Amino acid sequence: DRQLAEEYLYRYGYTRVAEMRGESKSLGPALLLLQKQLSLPETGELDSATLKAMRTPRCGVPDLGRFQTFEGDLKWHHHNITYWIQNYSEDLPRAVIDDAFARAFALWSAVTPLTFTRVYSRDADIVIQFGVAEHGDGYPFDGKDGLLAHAFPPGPGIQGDAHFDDDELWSLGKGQGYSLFLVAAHEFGHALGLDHSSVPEALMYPMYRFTEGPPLHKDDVNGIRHLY
Ligand SMILES: [Ca+2]
Ligand SMILES: [Ca+2]
Ligand SMILES: [Ca+2]
Ligand SMILES: [Zn+2]
Ligand SMILES: [Zn+2]
C-alpha cells in the first residue's frame, strides 16, 4: 500500500510540490496536499479514504503541475476547433464511437464560443487516439484500470490531443465497461484548457464516476467561462 501511495503522489504532482515546500521526506505533507486537492478529509495520514481514492480509476493528467513544459498560453486562439478520430477501439461500433465523441464536444460547444468540426488529417487541432502501454508520446498507459485516458492543453502538435487507454473496456457505462462519452467529455475539457476540479461531482474531477445525469456541473461551466 505504501508503494501505491508513493507512486500516486509522484505521478500526479503531489511529491514535487511537497519538496518545493521543504516537506520532502515523510509522506504526510504530500498526503495532505492530495486530500485537499481531492476533497477528502485532511488527515495527512495514509488512511482508508485516501487509499480508496488512490485505487480508484482516473484521468492520467497530473493534478498539480503538468506533464511537461508546453508552448503558448494554453487556450485556443481561434473558434473552429477541428478534431481527427485517428483510430478506433474495437469495443464499440465505429458509429457509436463517432457519436460519443460528437456528443462530448456538443456538451462543450453549448457553453463556449467554440465550434467543433470533424476532419481527417494530422492538421487537426485535437487528434484523438486509442492506444495501449507506450503509444507514441512518452506518457505510457498502464493496462486495465488505473489510468483511463489523458489529454494535453491547447496549442500546437501534441497539444490539444486526447488519448484513450484501449486496455480498458470502452462502452457507454451501462452494464460493463467505462463510458467513452463521459471520459471523452472530461478529456476534451483538458483539450480546451481546463484543469482538474476539486468538486467530486464535477465533470473535471479526476476520478471516474459513472452517471446517467447531465455531465456538466457549475464548476465545469464556470471554469470554461473563466477561460474564454
Ligand atoms: Ca480495441
Ligand atoms: Ca493537437
Ligand atoms: Ca489503464
Ligand atoms: Zn483529467
Ligand atoms: Zn498519450
Swiss-Prot record:
Induction: Activated by 4-aminophenylmercuric acetate and phorbol ester. Up-regulated by ARHGEF4, SPATA13 and APC via the JNK signaling pathway in colorectal tumor cells. Exists as monomer or homodimer; disulfide-linked. Also exists as heterodimer with LCN2. Macrophages and transformed cell lines produce only the monomeric form. Interacts with ECM1. It is linked to Intervertebral disc disease: A common musculo-skeletal disorder caused by degeneration of intervertebral disks of the lumbar spine. It results in low-back pain and unilateral leg pain. Metaphyseal anadysplasia 2: A bone development disorder characterized by skeletal anomalies that resolve spontaneously with age. Clinical characteristics are evident from the first months of life and include slight shortness of stature and a mild varus deformity of the legs. Patients attain a normal stature in adolescence and show improvement or complete resolution of varus deformity of the legs and rhizomelic micromelia. Processing of the precursor yields different active forms of 64, 67 and 82 kDa. Sequentially processing by MMP3 yields the 82 kDa matrix metalloproteinase-9. N- and O-glycosylated. It comes from the Eukaryota. In the arthritis patient this enzyme might contribute to the pathogenesis of joint destruction and might constitute a useful marker of disease status. The record marks 19-20, 66-67 as: Cleavage. Belongs to the peptidase M10A family. Coiled coil: none annotated. It is found in: Secreted, Extracellular space, Extracellular matrix. Residues 1-53 form a propeptide. Ca(2+) 1 binds at residues 91, 166, 168. Zn(2+) 1 binds at residues 135, 137, 150, 163. Matrix metalloproteinase that plays an essential role in local proteolysis of the extracellular matrix and in leukocyte migration. Could play a role in bone osteoclastic resorption. Cleaves KiSS1 at a Gly-|-Leu bond. Cleaves NINJ1 to generate the Secreted ninjurin-1 form. Cleaves type IV and type V collagen into large C-terminal three quarter fragments and shorter N-terminal one quarter fragments. Degrades fibronectin but not laminin or Pz-peptide. The active site is at residue 187. Changing residue 187 to Q: Loss of activity. This is Matrix metalloproteinase-9. The gene is MMP9. The chain holds residues 41 to 443 of 707 of the full protein. Zn(2+) 2 binds at residues 59, 186, 190, 196. A motif (Cysteine switch) lies at residues 57-64. Ca(2+) 3 binds at residues 142-143, 145, 147, 165, 168. Glycans are attached at residues 80, 87.
